Design a protein around this ligand. Structure first.
Ligand SMILES: O=C(O)c1nc2ccccc2nc1Nc1cccc(O)c1
Lengths: 8, 271
């Protein structure tokens, strides 16, 4: 499944 | 004289913008971080009374001595921006990319990393500083020394014992009391984000993506994780803030014993 960065 | 004291290299990234660089005085590798004034949320004041971004205030408070925190070496003010000169480890990789490339980390390695993050956060709190954006993206690995370094205090605040009602960190690392009530206390919110981080390390990705998952308080383990590690994670992710462990209780936890030294961590796991 999709691992992604998360912005602040 | 900022353009004549550092040699600017390639872009490292942006969100402001960060460049690789070299201090011309002694070939020290640095990072050059540009912050646009029109984007500064919270402002602070130095001892000199000069008004600066709170990020500069916080960085000065934690940059005394050695630690697992990225140190501010210098800063400059421009008409529309502040420029921050930071240490730069070389070679370096941030923990987000590291976990993406390697998958779920062996518990021995997650233990070493998590221990070092706890010591770094303890140092921030002792200096009066709350980071408020602990996550794998904001952790750098010095691959040759096996040392971790906290970066990006742009969402941080002075540490206090009363309730916070503002937040600009990463929502999927924020605790259920922020999601439900837009209120949190600093230390227990930090411990929650450390629980997310530890799950991330031993499972290869964060446990929750959606508000409903954050407040639901069910932790499903998608990878084989020891019973002792599961218990520490679930304790850090207790729904009620007062049920979460203190830093002392985390570091006294049975899963945390017999940590590797940083040099050993590099030799066994990073070289
Ligand atoms: O220090 C920060 O706030 C920071 N923010 C960033 C945002 C986006 C992309 C890269 C970023 N690098 C950053 N620091 C940094 C410092 C030293 C080495 C290094 O590789 C990175």
């Amino acid at each position: 499944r999709k691992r992604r960065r998360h912005p602040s | 004289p900022l353009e004549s004291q550092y040699q600017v290299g390639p872009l490292l990234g942006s969100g402001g913008s960060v460049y690789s660089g070299i201090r011309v005085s002694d070939n020290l590798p640095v990072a050059i971080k540009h912050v646009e004034k029109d984007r500064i949320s919270d402002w602070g004041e130095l001892p000199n009374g000069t008004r600066v971004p709170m990020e500069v205030v916080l960085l000065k408070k934690v940059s005394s001595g050695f630690s697992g925190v990225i140190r501010l070496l210098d800063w400059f003010e421009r008409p529309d921006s502040f420029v921050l000169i930071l240490e730069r480890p070389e070679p370096v990789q941030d923990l987000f990319d590291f976990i993406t490339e390697r998958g779920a980390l062996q518990e021995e390695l997650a233990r070493s990393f998590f221990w070092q993050v706890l010591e770094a956060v303890r140092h921030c709190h002792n200096c009066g500083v709350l980071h408020r954006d602990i996550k794998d993206e904001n952790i750098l690995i010095d691959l040759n020394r096996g040392e971790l370094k906290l970066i990006d205090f742009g969402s941080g605040a002075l540490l206090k014992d009363t309730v916070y009602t503002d937040f600009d960190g990463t929502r999927v690392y924020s605790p259920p009391e922020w999601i439900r009530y837009h209120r949190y206390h600093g230390r227990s919110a930090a411990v929650w984000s450390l629980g997310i981080l530890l799950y991330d390390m031993v499972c290869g990705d964060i446990p929750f993506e959606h508000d409903e998952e954050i407040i639901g308080g069910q932790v499903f383990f998608r990878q084989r994780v020891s019973s002792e590690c599961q218990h520490l994670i679930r304790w850090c992710l207790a729904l009620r803030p007062s049920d979460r462990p203190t830093f002392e209780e985390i570091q006294n936890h049975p899963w945390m014993q017999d940590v590797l030294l940083p040099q050993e961590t590099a030799e066994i796991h990073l070289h």
